[PDB]
Amino acid sequence: HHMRLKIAKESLLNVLSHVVGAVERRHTLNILSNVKIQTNAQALTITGSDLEVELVASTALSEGACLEAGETTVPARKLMEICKSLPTAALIDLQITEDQRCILKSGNSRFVLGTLPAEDYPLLTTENSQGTQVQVTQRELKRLFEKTAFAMAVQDVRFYLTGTLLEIDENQLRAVTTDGHRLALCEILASSTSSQLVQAIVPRKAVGELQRLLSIEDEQLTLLIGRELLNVTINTPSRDKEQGDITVRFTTKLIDGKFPDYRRVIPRGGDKHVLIGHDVFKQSLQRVAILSNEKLRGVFLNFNQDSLQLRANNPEQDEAIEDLAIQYQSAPLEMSFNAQYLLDVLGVLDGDDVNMSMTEANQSVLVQDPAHPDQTYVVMPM
Amino acid sequence: HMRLKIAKESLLNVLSHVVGAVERRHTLNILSNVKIQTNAQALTITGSDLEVELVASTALSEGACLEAGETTVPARKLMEICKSLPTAALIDLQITEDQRCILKSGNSRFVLGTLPAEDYPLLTTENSQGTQVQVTQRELKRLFEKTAFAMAVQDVRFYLTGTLLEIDENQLRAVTTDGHRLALCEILASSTSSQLVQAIVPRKAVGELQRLLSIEDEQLTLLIGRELLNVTINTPEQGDITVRFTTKLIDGKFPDYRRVIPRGGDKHVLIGHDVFKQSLQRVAILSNEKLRGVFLNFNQDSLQLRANNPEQDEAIEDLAIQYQSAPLEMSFNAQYLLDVLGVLDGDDVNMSMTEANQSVLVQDPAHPDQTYVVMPMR
């Protein structure tokens, strides 16, 4: 019949917090701006999606929480705001009427929102089958994205550039990202059945959502990677007085393309190798950059034996020059890089030293951390 | 030429005070630079946009000043360059004949383009003068916090975009208005001259002044003239820095604010501050996004807040208040009432009104020095 539910502010908001990151402020399909809420005596399920990424969060309800079972759709952003505005430990009474109106009462406050029918809410149907399953911990998966999120393109004509390639091969999961000017790669240990490689290009919004959901803990996760979709169920531990655990089901349409062979892009020529202290390199580039071109941000790195010179100048003829101590005994080379790209990779590296492998000025550069061989970064020249 | 050897922090502290006045782009290009003067005893840096002028001075250690001179250096760049250096670094400034400023710290060398110190324009002049006012930094700063929000952001009536400093016999007063609301605050301040004087201080001037002033009880002498307002502030550990602040006043006639405030309110309501702020915020969620309009209905012993939007969503909240006067219904911009609440530090809030189509006086019993007026909608 018609849904009615009485629950604590924190309980409702907590489940909602996990799903409303997927909801778009305005969407071509009007109903997707709303969250779908379904309740019965034992559990409350909330769904949020934009048809590319879908999140379903559910929790075990309290004894008297569901007065009347039912399902409906409520404007997600408003409801979330309404809940946060209530005082701590408040109790909300939700009522859905025959005319499509959702009535929220808490304390002396009375709110009324417009609802839309729950069966009009679109779900990501799984028309394919026989997907690949990968076993990986949350930390390992979260790490893959943290070390490669930056090089992804924000918006572009070519779609696969905007996503993260997730590849499974020989008991190791890999994440690869590129915008055409740089590349990031991270590899971790995962368990899977397939002997052959499987590839999934995960859209940028989905990657962000997953990053928020994952934790540092080593809880095992099972990823189902199909030709058209990627599925993962995560159990978030909700620790509150008498609060049930929240289970979130993540579904995302994979980007339809074929990612470029990343291995061919990675330089293994390695003629010249340099090792530099991470702090010195980071600090020096920031200094030199101040006088580089404002949008372009290009600086010149001149490599000489055991000494790196950073040089930058702008249109106003201002110049910055600094000398750094580096572990380099090979031939001389001067290159120019978009500073920010170097600074971006440095943010990703947790080790004390930084190593670069170079061949020629025109050619690309390979950057890494000796301590962590799992991460590999490439930066092209100007 | 000018040469100077100064610690990173010493140079940085001086620049930080003055950089707020500098503009990213200015019609006169030189004002994007900061003017630097040095001699054996002191360092003086000036930042200005020709509406507000800041001059920061410090006592230089002997021998820091290798050569005395003056010049102008791009302020934003200099500021960033100094921040990028390591802690406790030593900077060597050098000005060459070809207008290049060479700055060397550690292993890094920086070169900026300079412009003639001669060209740099100054607001002040020898015959500037001014009627003195004695006021504490804490009190002056307080005056600005209380009335700053109600100034108009942009308006043809240029006077509206500034705070009016008015001096009464025993106190200094700050008044701001944008047409839809008004803020007023009074603080005791000594007056040597005992003549009413009005100064309309520009919005940027007020912001700069708020940043520089501190919450301590240090007396200040404020010079107020027909065209400028001047005050020397010694800032409250990096030695000691004195800043000379000068501003071009808005040459206009501020409206008679006393007419605008209404003392005739018959209908009076007292509401808990926290309750009112929370309630208003809750109901405002479901109000028009651009307009932010909420309805306040006054009934015996209760306050009803109601808001709706185009999607016909509705929020209603009831507040228990002691009101036994005739029922009144009014429409207000939620932001205007919330803004007033932000500057009220007291536990209760007093509202006095006459009719639905007329203004409302808002006050905090604990602090009678502050008075606010909000004009209703429709």
Side-chain angles (χ1 to χ4, degrees), chain A residues 78 101 109-110 318 321, chain B residues 77 109 312-313 316-317:
Chain A
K78 287 168 187 173
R101 310 293 285 165
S109 297
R110 186 185 186 248
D318 300 355
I321 291 184
Chain B
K77 282 164 189 169
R109 173 185 170 107
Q312 297 296 106
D313 294 348
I316 303 184
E317 190 155 346

Side-chain angles (χ1 to χ4, degrees), chain A residues 87-157 159-240 242-333:
Chain A
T88 187
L91 188 147
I92 308 163
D93 170 49
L94 270 179
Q95 186 173 355
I96 306 301
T97 68
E98 174 54 315
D99 36 340
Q100 314 201 277
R101 310 293 285 165
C102 166
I103 299 157
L104 275 66
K105 301 205 287 217
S106 173
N108 286 304
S109 297
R110 186 185 186 248
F111 301 89
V112 179
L113 297 166
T115 69
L116 293 166
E119 71 281 5
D120 296 343
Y121 196 90
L123 294 161
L124 271 46
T125 49
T126 89
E127 162 180 14
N128 272 24
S129 188
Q130 297 310 46
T132 311
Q133 300 226 71
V134 191
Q135 319 281 324
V136 57
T137 64
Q138 295 201 18
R139 196 194 86 256
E140 287 166 353
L141 186 53
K142 197 184 174 67
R143 184 193 167 71
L144 283 179
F145 296 132
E146 298 188 327
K147 304 309 189 173
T148 59
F150 73 97
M152 218 177 312
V154 187
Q155 264 289 357
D156 264 336
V157 168
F159 284 103
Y160 84 75
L161 276 191
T162 49
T164 271
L165 174 70
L166 270 195
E167 191 195 64
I168 296 100
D169 184 8
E170 71 215 348
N171 293 326
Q172 91 167 344
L173 184 69
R174 204 184 313 240
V176 181
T177 189
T178 185
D179 58 12
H181 300 262
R182 42 182 186 175
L183 177 135
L185 178 145
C186 196
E187 76 195 15
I188 56 83
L189 177 63
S191 163
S192 86
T193 167
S194 318
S195 272
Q196 69 285 0
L197 62 80
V198 177
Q199 307 186 337
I201 299 180
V202 184
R204 143 169 286 275
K205 193 180 181 180
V207 176
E209 289 313 312
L210 177 63
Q211 257 181 299
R212 181 174 55 65
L213 255 54
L214 299 165
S215 82
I216 293 306
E217 272 64 63
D218 295 37
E219 179 212 358
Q220 201 88 351
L221 275 173
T222 312
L223 295 174
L224 179 80
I225 305 181
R227 212 209 318 255
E228 173 192 24
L229 297 175
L230 185 156
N231 289 270
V232 70
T233 290
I234 315 173
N235 265 255
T236 306
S238 199
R239 309 291 187 188
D240 277 298
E242 261 130 358
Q243 257 201 36
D245 336 24
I246 295 158
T247 301
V248 185
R249 178 165 72 237
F250 174 96
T251 313
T252 194
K253 295 205 72 66
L254 292 178
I255 280 180
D256 186 0
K258 207 217 57 183
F259 207 82
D261 185 3
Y262 59 91
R263 308 158 197 274
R264 307 178 49 238
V265 159
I266 305 186
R268 293 178 179 83
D271 293 345
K272 311 184 181 59
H273 316 295
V274 201
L275 188 147
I276 294 169
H278 186 282
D279 53 326
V280 279
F281 193 30
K282 185 172 214 160
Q283 291 304 312
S284 75
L285 295 174
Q286 294 176 347
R287 273 192 288 271
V288 176
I290 292 167
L291 295 304
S292 52
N293 289 284
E294 296 184 349
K295 165 192 71 161
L296 292 200
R297 307 298 273 180
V299 308
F300 295 92
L301 277 51
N302 190 32
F303 295 97
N304 303 309
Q305 297 62 13
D306 285 354
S307 186
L308 169 65
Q309 160 140 327
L310 302 311
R311 168 174 51 92
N313 42 74
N314 50 16
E316 296 85 357
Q317 288 204 131
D318 300 355
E319 188 186 330
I321 291 184
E322 196 173 344
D323 275 13
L324 177 63
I326 66 175
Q327 165 171 318
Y328 186 77
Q329 181 65 245
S330 198
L333 182 51

Side-chain angles (χ1 to χ4, degrees), chain B residues 286-358:
Chain B
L286 285 174
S287 61
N288 180 305
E289 49 157 350
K290 310 289 167 44
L291 286 54
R292 303 300 281 171
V294 301
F295 296 85
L296 286 65
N297 299 329
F298 292 97
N299 307 316
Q300 297 61 13
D301 294 302
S302 157
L303 171 52
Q304 188 207 356
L305 303 192
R306 172 172 54 87
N308 64 34
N309 46 14
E311 311 82 304
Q312 297 296 106
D313 294 348
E314 190 179 44
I316 303 184
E317 190 155 346
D318 276 28
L319 276 66
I321 63 176
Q322 285 181 353
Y323 181 75
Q324 222 64 35
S325 290
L328 185 58
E329 175 204 311
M330 313 202 48
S331 203
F332 281 114
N333 173 321
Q335 203 52 50
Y336 292 171
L337 298 175
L338 285 176
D339 273 333
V340 165
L341 294 176
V343 304
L344 290 185
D345 305 321
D347 297 359
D348 298 335
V349 167
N350 317 330
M351 290 188 44
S352 318
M353 68 193 88
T354 62
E355 298 280 287
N357 69 327
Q358 314 271 318

Side-chain angles (χ1 to χ4, degrees), chain A residues 325-342:
Chain A
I326 66 175
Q327 165 171 318
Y328 186 77
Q329 181 65 245
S330 198
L333 182 51
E334 180 181 72
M335 311 192 59
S336 64
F337 299 102
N338 187 340
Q340 194 53 55
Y341 294 166
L342 294 171

